[PDB]
Design a protein around this ligand. Sequence first.
Ligand SMILES: Nc1nc2c(c(=O)[nH]1)N[C@H]1C(S)=C(S)[C@@H](COP(=O)(O)OP(=O)(O)OC[C@H]3O[C@@H](n4cnc5c(=O)[nH]c(N)nc54)[C@H](O)[C@@H]3O)O[C@H]1N2
Ligand SMILES: Nc1nc2c(c(=O)[nH]1)N[C@H]1C(S)=C(S)[C@@H](COP(=O)(O)OP(=O)(O)OC[C@H]3O[C@@H](n4cnc5c(=O)[nH]c(N)nc54)[C@H](O)[C@@H]3O)O[C@H]1N2
Ligand SMILES: */O=C1\C([C])=C([C][C]=C([C])[C])C(=O)C(O[C])=C1O[C]
Ligand SMILES: COC1=C(OC)C(=O)C(CC=C(C)C)=C(C)C1=O
Ligand code: SF4
Ligand code: SF4
Ligand code: SF4
Ligand code: SF4
Ligand code: SF4
Ligand code: SF4
Ligand code: SF4
Ligand code: SF4
Ligand code: SF4
Ligand SMILES: [Mo]
Lengths: 193, 193, 734, 250, 250
Amino acid sequence: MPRYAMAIDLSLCVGCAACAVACKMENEVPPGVFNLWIREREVGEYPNLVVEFRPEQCLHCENPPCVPVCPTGASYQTKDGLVLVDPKKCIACGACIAACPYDARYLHPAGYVSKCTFCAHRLEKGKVPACVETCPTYCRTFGDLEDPESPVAKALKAAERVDVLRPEQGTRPKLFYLNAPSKKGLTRESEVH
Amino acid sequence: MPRYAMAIDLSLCVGCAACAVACKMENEVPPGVFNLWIREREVGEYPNLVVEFRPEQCLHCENPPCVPVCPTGASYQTKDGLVLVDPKKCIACGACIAACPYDARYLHPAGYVSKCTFCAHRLEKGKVPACVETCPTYCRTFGDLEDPESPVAKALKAAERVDVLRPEQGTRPKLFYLNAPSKKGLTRESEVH
Amino acid sequence: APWYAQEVKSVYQICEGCFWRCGIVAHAVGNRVYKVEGYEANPKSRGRLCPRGQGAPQTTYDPDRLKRPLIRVEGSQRGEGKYRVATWEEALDHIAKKMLEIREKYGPEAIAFFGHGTGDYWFVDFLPAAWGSPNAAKPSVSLCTAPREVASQWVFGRPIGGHEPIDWENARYIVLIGHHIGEDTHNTQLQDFALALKNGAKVVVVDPRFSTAAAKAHRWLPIKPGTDTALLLAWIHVLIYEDLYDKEYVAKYTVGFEELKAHVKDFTPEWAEKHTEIPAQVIREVAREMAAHKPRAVLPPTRHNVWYGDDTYRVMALLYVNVLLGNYGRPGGFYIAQSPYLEKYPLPPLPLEPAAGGCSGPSGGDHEPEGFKPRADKGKFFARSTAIQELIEPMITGEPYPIKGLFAYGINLFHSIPNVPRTKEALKNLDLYVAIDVLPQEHVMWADVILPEATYLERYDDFVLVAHKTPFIQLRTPAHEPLFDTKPGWWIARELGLRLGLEQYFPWKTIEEYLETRLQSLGLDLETMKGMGTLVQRGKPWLEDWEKEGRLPFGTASGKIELYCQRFKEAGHQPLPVFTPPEEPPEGFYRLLYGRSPVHTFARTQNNWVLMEMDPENEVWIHKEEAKRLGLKEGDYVMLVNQDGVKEGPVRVKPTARIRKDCVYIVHGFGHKAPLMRLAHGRGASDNYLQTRYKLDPISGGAGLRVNFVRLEKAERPRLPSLTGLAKRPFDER
Amino acid sequence: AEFYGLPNAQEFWHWTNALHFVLVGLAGGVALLAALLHLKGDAEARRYTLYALMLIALDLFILWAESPARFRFTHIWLFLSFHPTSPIWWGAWGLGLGFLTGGLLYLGKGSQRALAWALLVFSLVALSYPGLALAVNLNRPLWNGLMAGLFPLTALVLALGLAALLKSPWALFPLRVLAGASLLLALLYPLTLPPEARGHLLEEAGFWYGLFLLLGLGTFWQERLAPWAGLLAAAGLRALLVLAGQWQGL
Amino acid sequence: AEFYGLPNAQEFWHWTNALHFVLVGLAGGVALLAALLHLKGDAEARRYTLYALMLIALDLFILWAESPARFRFTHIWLFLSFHPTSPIWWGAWGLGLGFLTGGLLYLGKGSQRALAWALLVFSLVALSYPGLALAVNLNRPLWNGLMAGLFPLTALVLALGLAALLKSPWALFPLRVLAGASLLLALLYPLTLPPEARGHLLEEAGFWYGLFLLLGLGTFWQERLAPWAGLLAAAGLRALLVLAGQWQGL
Ligand SMILES: Nc1nc2c(c(=O)[nH]1)N[C@H]1C(S)=C(S)[C@@H](COP(=O)(O)OP(=O)(O)OC[C@H]3O[C@@H](n4cnc5c(=O)[nH]c(N)nc54)[C@H](O)[C@@H]3O)O[C@H]1N2
Ligand SMILES: Nc1nc2c(c(=O)[nH]1)N[C@H]1C(S)=C(S)[C@@H](COP(=O)(O)OP(=O)(O)OC[C@H]3O[C@@H](n4cnc5c(=O)[nH]c(N)nc54)[C@H](O)[C@@H]3O)O[C@H]1N2
Ligand SMILES: */O=C1\C([C])=C([C][C]=C([C])[C])C(=O)C(O[C])=C1O[C]
Ligand SMILES: COC1=C(OC)C(=O)C(CC=C(C)C)=C(C)C1=O
Ligand code: SF4
Ligand code: SF4
Ligand code: SF4
Ligand code: SF4
Ligand code: SF4
Ligand code: SF4
Ligand code: SF4
Ligand code: SF4
Ligand code: SF4
Ligand SMILES: [Mo]
């Protein structure tokens, strides 16, 4: 019934990869695959140099292309907006990886697809995700979008600007990048070459 | 040598179609068509009510899809970045209309296709475009993007954010919207209902 | 199957990820700490942790980690890697045997003790002093911090210290000279910096590289390297000559500024601009801007200060700017950090007990005839601190006097000390070489008897006390017992203490006993601390707390500006004029630079798969146009050859534009040549190996490192084992 | 939501042009038939060439009679320039040259296999350009890549459907194969669209679409309904995509 | 441009899932031949029905064989859930019911030629699903709408290529017709992509692409070159599009 979301204030992200490492430890994400990674890109030229540190992970899209594509039903979207995988039904076919626009998904070496989980295991015990917890810069917030006391909600409200990766896709990413450092918004590779 | 552009500050635009009427007048744009129009969209409920007034007209895309698709060579991009039509070659096939992602062109009743000209007629004689001159709010700026002194260059430099319509087509518009009212950026019909 | 829906045991710990020693909570399931977390109530981590802290646990579960003592196979050459497994007993006897031989032939001072880490209290500060060697050194002094500690001891009479006392939260204007925060991922500092960004604080980063901190800055001054002092002097000049400084602060807590004004007379924003390449106007503007925010404008001194070799001058100058903004001891700049009270274990005095900074009778009038031989680097620079890179010359020329026998406790000899060939030569020449430390790293293999030391999560370490607003104490309990034939450092020091007849210094049989005795002073018992972790004490932070009390904190009476008497009296001119134009790189070279990669803490983290996975190699930063002129592109690898011909393994080329054309930048700590650290092994380039030279700071012990130049030769992309494949080797607890 | 003035988002290609679209399909595909016939040395190659010429003429005539610049006489530029990136330019040259090539074939002048391969190539240009005239407009969500598949296959169903009405014996089997292909791709077409575009196609059309899908199924039923059904499905589908795909829509 | 960690942008369907793509082309294409041969009464309806059962089975084995989830036996869920939005799901049943159906047809029992209608339907589902399993991912620029057309056309080129090598008289002509349709759409495909997607395609594959296009032109020459040359072209393109389109790309 809530709408779970994550917001990352890029004006504060320094791209240390603490969240990324906290994730790997917590979810014991195996070598070679990542639920979370950082992307750092410069937009350039001296008087006007801009570096965007951008942590990427499952955005737990509100309209996830990775769910519909699943034949098994292992890819499901939860009532509060978490896209999760039930590995019991996963036939590791990769359809969801093909349909995920963000590279958030991987084949776990145990034979099923995995990806960030919004720390489902913690959310139920009433805790905040591990990446949100460890963040030194206090740039990531989390919570229920609909609860205005939520740290995501308040941050979205306080943001000077809010962006999302590949909005043009159908998805409605529920991971919001707040104050994007470049005036043109989130950095894209096509805008480089 | 210049790379011509236009910058419109949306934080100042009030959607009084002055520019739209000035162009209608200056360019004798016949009745049912328009090189320039204003779109006005509201975003949001009570305590966060934003209204975006947005003039729309040829963006004189730098990578104009409206040019390659033209069979005759009527549709052409100038060395300074103006997208124009040599009516003498225009067969009014409408290919350029099909290709323009911005509803910027029309079939003029004289038998050829027309659209915002960046007031090439005025540009050539050293004047600024009609829209730019008649504008109570001074939100539009024009100039050579390459000249750090030009009004557009300055405008862009001083902008809090810069946006462009449908950036994901890859047209590289040269009509920049500054300081869009909504945190999420330029308004799209898709983010409605 | 997930560690968290299974057995967990959660101890309060202390991170040995770096020396910030963040207080953490360690969660183990069996003998494997799976997650570590910061905890509020610990002023350092306050619930958060940096990447390295989160991944730090892996070393314990590193296959490659050291497991049992080892003794160099007699007859084999130190270079070679032939060792035989020894018993803790046989190793400790072998060491005590050799040490006493050296003692009874050369004296104790002929054994040098190099160390780093929490355990370095045993192997650097206590045990060598019990044994009477003054040649105990940490790289965090002359390879990092020494210029700023000397400068800070001269100017206030205090240390900047481990957890530097910048009142980040109330700062309104922060000027960073170097200080690549965000890359330097010291936990509380990043939190404090983030917070200050959040509260609207404005940041100015002075640095030839557009670094992460510059990415968050309102002004980036891409200063010409080695030119910072010129900038700072021009700031002192705008602050004084435009009369923007805090007069009463100057008038009441300062002594001697009537010397600074005259000194800086010609050090103009136009003079500075010539050298600096920062336009006079921006120079003037920044000075005015920090003045406009007076006592909430700070120029927090950076930590690694050992650049160029005239570094104490640079720090002095910068500390004067702070004084001139009258920010020291006020909200918004620096608070006064007081050490916490925790009584030492009662013991007889040590043969040698040093003083660390407080001077007036610094080195000369304080080291000579009293214990016995002086620190072997005693006359090389003015300051009394021991300079690690200055104690390895005796190892070779045997000059001042011979240094036979060297201990290397958790200290990278080939990565942390410049001039690796010299260090290697020094090792061969040794009668004894010991290497205590966790994984197998090039320098450890060169030892005569290696000692695996219980990982921070497996041992109890004597309390950590951090001077701070609020003085606190930390305690690390072992989450699970040592693995393999591994031992805690306090235990190794105790045995090597008993074996050398220093039993009076180690009258306590156990560390729990040792900790309890100490804990007893603060009506506290060990069990109790184990449930708290961190015991935070009061502490005075602002000048007003001192003053309303009748006292002021400093050295001699007040803050000496541009002063310190016995230097000007004898040995060296007093102020920072030494803007002294750095020697510029030869043609075809760049001035090597170096820094930190958020995920990695010096070179000891390359074999960590969790962390290597985030950053498997370093990358050389060269300007886009420079890279374009050389013929390099984004996919390219290159060898960096320094001015002395040393070549460093292929490193990826990063053209990307955040650097002057003047420079090149590589993260420190890569380029290991340690086949047994299977992941670390042949990746990236090592700056230390290219840092064949250094310019010694005559004042502090500093090894000025940014004085090396490097050239790029194209190289083939390297062939390396798959890191994931190596990451997957399971950890066999045996 | 509200405007002052209006964006020029009105239909630029009318029923008139959709007709051109159905016709150039016929034209091109009959020119392919004539080419392949000349190539098998089959006797019918001659009149199929006349037809491909007629349909080429009929198509150029309505391309011109429907052009707002019909009396400005600017189409000459179609032929005095080189615009390889433009489908309509390709289309002008394919048909045009395909009409000369097929003109000489008819008049037994200027060679004859080398003219039949030419007709083959120009008729592939003409069969190919319509779907691409649509498909290159990546701003129009309905004119996706499949248009480059739907238009060529559909132009074939038109030609073969015609050939079969004219009782040519060879064609009622290819007509069913190609009509099966076209209808399968036409059925999977909507599933190839982003939700909003499919929903737009379904709202604005569909029922017509779905009717054209059913219709075309009669190409596999009764012998003499088969070409009509195939013709109307293929033409209905072509015109409907042309009219319904002129949408930029967000 | 620089990362700490890495996006999981690694190939997800490897050369083995490109191999299955080729076989399910065959499996579905032949299953179509079979049902049509049934429906048509043809003597060969049996020969081809037991082939399609092998091809189908070979594929379903390769489908499980290549799945990292094989020894976890999770495929049973492919058949115990309703997931109409999922191309792959539709192919599980299309090949599953297509199997049973082809069993009940080969074992001449249960029912006759009402079952060939079911086999026809299931084969269309099996012919349709890969093509859509790719095109459904609107985040993959290369896998555009044409995949939904290029795969079924190409699967029949495979089925008819096989059929023609097992010397069935009927197979050559339709193989050369669908091979022409296949090859022409395959040629138009690049022109359908946005410039960066096309550029990616030409640098990543292309040669390979232009090779298989050229190779496929071999269906229109000799015999026992023809079925081969069209068969390698169809499987080339199929495997290459699966391999080259796993790009997300900006
Ligand atoms: N060239 C160059 N030199 C430098 C620097 C530089 O950037 N460039 N940085 C300088 C700075 S600022 C500093 S602070 C110093 C850092 O100096 P160091 O601490 O020397 O650097 P590390 O590479 O961290 O190596 C420490 C060693 O301790 C081992 N170790 C880790 N944990 C433990 C433990 O629990 N017990 C034991 N016994 N050993 C352990 C590691 O394996 C490693 O060998 O280096 C200085 N030296
Ligand atoms: N991840 C991580 N973080 C760490 C550590 C770690 O090992 N890993 N180690 C910690 C330790 S002990 C230390 S000492 C610190 C080290 O970090 P700091 O104390 O921040 O070191 P600095 O040299 O001050 O800053 C690095 C920057 O100095 C710049 N620099 C180089 N030359 C010049 C110059 O001439 N003028 C100026 N203004 N700038 C210049 C470089 O371009 C670089 O971006 O970080 C600590 N934090
Ligand atoms: O195919 C079309 C052609 C070929 C032209 C112009 C050419 C001639 C020979 C009259 C068009 O104008 C047109 O649009 C009406 C075509 O289809 C869109
Ligand atoms: C990607 O191609 C396919 C899969 O991925 C391996 C499947 O799992 C499945 C699952 C279904 C069965 C019948 C084994 C099908 C049908 C398929 O086509
Ligand atoms: S903790 Fe913040 S700054 Fe660090 S990687 Fe995560 S989002 Fe980026
Ligand atoms: S890999 Fe698993 S979760 Fe993903 S689509 Fe296949 S069955 Fe579903
Ligand atoms: S980001 Fe990708 S994997 Fe995550 S929910 Fe959205 S579509 Fe699925
Ligand atoms: S929410 Fe949990 S799983 Fe997702 S990135 Fe953060 S720690 Fe990892
Ligand atoms: S004239 Fe100015 S205010 Fe009026 S519509 Fe144009 S930009 Fe907006
Ligand atoms: S309508 Fe005119 S300008 Fe547009 S493509 Fe046709 S000829 Fe060119
Ligand atoms: S705005 Fe329209 S006319 Fe201008 S370049 Fe873009 S598509 Fe062409
Ligand atoms: S620039 Fe010219 S075409 Fe554009 S709105 Fe102004 S007058 Fe009209
Ligand atoms: S600063 Fe980071 S790496 Fe260092 S001890 Fe603290 S958490 Fe560990
Ligand atoms: Mo340091």
